[PDB]
A = this chain, B = another copy of it.
């Protein structure tokens, strides 16, 4: 069946620390001699509504930050810099459990695993998709700022997300410092763009339905990619872009992408009765790589 699958979180658990500055504490990511954490740890919650982060960074010394590791084996800060919405702290011990890793920005529709932590303590893991409005729908209580999202290729962890703020709608930074969707890290109200169904994932989900013998929705009728995308612009679906993973499902089932593009337009009008792989709505948080891997 189709389960929400995350990467095993051991490699990332061994990198979580608690970062403290003033009365603010949160989670941080310890890679080699660097500890990454959200920069709003420097902001007293009284002034979190409008901070001047550069003035905040001037007023700080390496003594303004403390870093603690709770899990596993149990840091002095000798450097501090700011990189967009992240603090980049330098510590005097290299994390002896740093995994091979990269930094890459994920795109809307793509899935990654999240290690929710509190006070440097990993508490749970789940998978989210980067929404078209550059938010994610996960579970983030008070104190999970600095929790980390990632994918894994071979032995290489791709760190792609550090949690920053709740707008059950959440957003955060890539490890280059830039916020997903350009949201500001200040507790002012800000308007998010409209969310959309991720069309390539709905299509992968329907292929999964077909591979499990649930194909009542397949008709001979087709709509072209060109025409679907023109329809998508008016109905809050993303632009459909085919990939090799999608092609593999079309080959295995013998059902063409265009047949599913047409069925989406009908199923969006409403499921009739009637159910698909358990649910009464379209599912867009399983990727073609998900479906290929699991089925």
Contacts and interface: CB of A to CB of B under 8 A. Distances in A.
B5 A8 contact: no
Contact of A8 (B123, B169, B212, B279): B123
A143 interface: no
A277 B137 CA distance: 12
A220 interface: no
Interface in A126-155: 126, 128, 137-139
A294 B139 contact: yes
Nearest to A97: B72
A3 B139 contact: yes
A1 interface: yes
A7 B14 CA distance: 15
Given A1-B138, A1-B139, A280-B279, A124 B6 contact: yes
Interface string A1-32: 11111111111011000000000000000000
Contacts of A116: 5
A279 B3 CA distance: 15
A61 interface: no
A74 interface: no
Contacts of A169: 1
A3 B137 CA distance: 8
A115 interface: yes
A281 interface: yes
10 contacts: A3-B4, A3-B126, A5-B125, A5-B126, A5-B139, A8-B9, A10-B13, A139-B294, A168-B212, A279-B281
Interface of A: 1-11, 13-14, 71, 115-116, 122-126, 128, 137-139, 168-169, 212, 275, 278-281, 294
Q: Which 8 A-B pairs have the closest CB atoms?
A: A10-B10, A1-B168, A8-B122, A10-B13, A5-B124, A280-B280, A3-B126, A4-B4
